[PDB]
């Protein structure tokens, strides 16, 4: 369905397996989804690989609102590193309601300054 531009799944306990399966769909060349919202979805560290893949693979995705889930302190560092290679994501990257360490916050702040095309990342503070 090429007309579907916004999908909100926050609150569903999709799990890591859930994200994996959704990504297979999202990585399809005809997918036009622009906004994917994933707040608490019972996520863990594993899904970061698939989310990272999503961030750099999809040419359609513009906003990925990962919210109150244990994304992982290292998982987000992968996002920081990959979202430098001409990513098409411009909007909210989520990562709200999530505790990060000093180095992580610094990396996210650095990303925000170096890539202004990314409106706002939205850390906890």
């Amino acid at each position: 369905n090429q007309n579907l531009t916004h999908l909100y799944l926050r609150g569903n306990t999709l799990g890591d397996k859930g994200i994996k399966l959704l990504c297979e769909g999202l990585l399809h060349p005809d997918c036009k989804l622009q906004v994917l919202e994933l707040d608490n979805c019972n996520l863990t560290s594993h899904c970061c690989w698939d989310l990272s893949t999503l961030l750099t693979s999809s040419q359609s995705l513009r906003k990925l609102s990962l919210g109150n889930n244990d994304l992982g302190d290292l998982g987000v560092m992968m996002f920081c590193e990959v979202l430098k290679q001409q990513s098409c994501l411009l909007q909210n990257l989520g990562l709200s309601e999530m505790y990060f360490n000093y180095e992580t916050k610094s990396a996210l702040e650095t990303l925000q300054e170096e890539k202004p095309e990314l409106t706002v990342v939205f850390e906890p503070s």
Binding site: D73, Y99, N101, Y102
Partner: protein
């Protein structure tokens, strides 16, 4: 410090989130050093470095990491200095073993019924020890003493009538086989009580005449412990023993060796209240003594100390205050240990009114 081996754990993560965290402040009464319940700053902001008394007080008062849960264990005597910082606590009292549980302990401790039954009968026949075995520490000491008697196969007799007798008995069967270094160990304990130290460095042991060779003897013959949990801090296997040794120190033959001064500082947190130090001092100061370490105790000093102890009882028994050092029954415990009618009756004549619970 109390976390996994990683020196830099996620302190700034969920570890900062209260209500999901419970602290276990084990041994409030063992906080060596003066503890002021009234302080200037209340050390808010956990990341700020401050003195240990303030840090603990701030946690206790729920100003540091508020909404977090806190469990405290303590000797009831130390409630005097703790109740001022609780506001709305739930107080739980720990009671010792019932007759049924005393029995289970013996059978679990000993390798089989062949010895557990003998141990149980040997103790049960002794009304006093059986009653004293209310306390896990006492039944442990008695069982350990029996285990040592079993190894030698001497008799397994258990005829002790007092707390002191149990502790003296324990050392007799442990050190007699050491005797030449007992003074050093006693000195160490006394120094620790007066200098607010439970955990000793090897340097402190050496400075009291105990260097490696004898120290190991105490580690083997379960009397003294090393703390090898990624540390090198030596201590007595239980605070009651440290107080016991300090008590003997005053009666042998370097804080002072002045019992009057010791007694003057009894009702104080700073010295750990010296409850067992005195309770044992009373039991040790007797004429009805025998051999095996006991004969190395100074008879001349005991006679000099006995007099001051009697004066101490008269002075304290006279008090009619509550939440005060020896509150009647405590003096009775002291007199119970000193099982000599001449002394006890003279001491008891200073109690025209007895109020006990």
């Amino acid at each position: 410090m109390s976390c996994c081996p990683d020196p830099n754990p996620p302190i700034h993560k969920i570890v900062r989130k209260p209500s999901r965290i419970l602290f276990l402040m084990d041994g409030f009464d063992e906080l060596q050093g003066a503890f002021d319940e009234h302080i200037g700053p209340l050390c808010t902001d956990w990341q700020k470095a401050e003195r240990g008394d303030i840090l603990l007080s701030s946690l206790i008062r729920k100003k540091l990491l508020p909404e977090a849960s806190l469990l405290i264990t303590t000797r009831p005597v130390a409630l005097e200095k703790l109740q001022h910082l609780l506001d709305h606590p739930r107080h739980v009292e720990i009671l010792g073993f019932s007759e049924a549980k005393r029995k289970e302990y013996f059978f679990k401790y000993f390798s089989d019924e062949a010895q557990a039954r003998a141990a149980f009968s040997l103790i049960q026949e002794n009304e006093v020890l059986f009653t004293m075995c209310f306390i896990p520490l006492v039944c442990w000491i008695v069982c350990t003493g029996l285990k040592q008697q079993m190894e030698s196969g001497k008799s397994l007799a258990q005829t002790s009538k007092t707390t002191t007798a149990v502790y003296v008995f324990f050392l007799s069967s442990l050190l007699q086989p050491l005797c030449a270094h007992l003074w050093g160990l006693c000195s160490l304990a006394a120094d620790g009580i007066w200098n607010q130290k439970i955990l000793f460095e090897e340097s402190d042991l050496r400075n009291h005449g105990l260097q490696k060779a004898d120290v190991s003897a105490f580690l083997r013959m379960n009397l003294f412990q090393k703390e090898v949990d990624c540390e090198k801090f030596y201590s007595f296997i239980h605070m009651t023993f440290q107080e016991f040794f300090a008590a003997m120190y005053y009666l042998l033959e370097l804080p002072s060796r002045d019992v009057t001064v010791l007694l003057e500082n009894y009702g104080k947190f700073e010295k750990g209240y010296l409850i067992f130090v005195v309770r044992f001092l009373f039991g040790l100061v007797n004429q009805e003594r025998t051999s095996y370490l006991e004969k190395k105790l100074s008879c001349k000093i005991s006679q000099q100390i006995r007099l001051e102890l009697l004066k101490w009882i008269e002075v304290k028994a006279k008090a009619k205050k509550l939440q005060i050092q020896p509150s009647q029954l405590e003096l009775f415990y002291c007199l119970y240990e000193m099982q000599e009618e001449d002394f006890v009756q003279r001491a008891m004549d200073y109690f025209p009114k007895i109020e006990i619970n």
